Amino acid sequence: SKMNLSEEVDLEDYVARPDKISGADINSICQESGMLAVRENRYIVLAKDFEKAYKTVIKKDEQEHEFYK
Amino acid sequence: RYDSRTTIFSPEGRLYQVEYAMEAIGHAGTCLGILANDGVLLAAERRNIHKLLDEVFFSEKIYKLNEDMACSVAGITSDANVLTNELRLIAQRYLLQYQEPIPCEQLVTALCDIKQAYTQFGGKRPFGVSLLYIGWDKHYGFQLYQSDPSGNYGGWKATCIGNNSAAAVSMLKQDYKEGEMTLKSALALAIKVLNKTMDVSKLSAEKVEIATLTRENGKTVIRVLKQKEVEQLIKKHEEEEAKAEREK
């Protein structure tokens, strides 16, 4: 509500995903998307930045070791 | 401290690992054998009575060893499984070698001999499972035998193990009946004690398992009671309980 979001940014396509992201994760998804929009000197957060940031906060596994599964 | 290995003797002479295995039976299930002539029974309890548990065995706590021997179990599941496998193997070995059924005590002696060996040789955890035995023989007839994870055993007329073992044995002693212990009275006493030693009241039939051994025409039929007869037994106990409230 305080973030400057482009009209093409439809929040529903991210809230309907089955990933069990927490409220802290949600705030992370928002803040890092805004950060990515800032990096490109853009003053409006686009859906591309939201999708890019959405992939970096839900891939928490990353390291793992592939043999605990 | 002196409980690192099962072969370590404490300065007071106490095998701490053994007693740790002994006291762990409090986490085991409730199985009891009541006094009874011309018969004998065990009354087990099903902790895991979750609805998603399909029932296939109907004897998860009741095992038959010989054609005239049955035993319950109270301890670690894997230990109980291997112990009952060894039980059946030893009973069948005796049957093959002597062409005669094992006479109750010598089978229990065999298990206790195997069990104590784990408490003496290093590198093996003591068998943390105690188990009742029932059976009949041409020597002493119906007997009730108490296994104990230390390899110690003992003849018994009425005993219980597992959760609330002390309460169960005290209640069995409260109404302890010698001689006049007909099978109906034994079943009634088993239901009556299970009503209190089990925290859950009303003694649901599906959560209570009774196995009986009787001498019928020299066959020693080992019976596990189905849901209908357990239901009528708990019904009999309930009707008897209603009369007991007339005092007030």
Partner: protein, 69 residues
Amino acid sequence: DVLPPEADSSIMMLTSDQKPDVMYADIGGMDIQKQEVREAVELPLTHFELYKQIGIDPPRGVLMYGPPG
């Protein structure tokens, strides 16, 4: 002369300039959790008469628990 006691910030009691600045509407969802917390730590202070009208002492402690974030 007796001087008024000095216990303004002995153990970091929140001063007028240390308000967290977090509105109830700022936090998202948590409607049941907000109501239960508001019903033990905020409502009793204001509407104590409504608590006393039924005969119950207001609950004194709450424990918020759950996954991190």
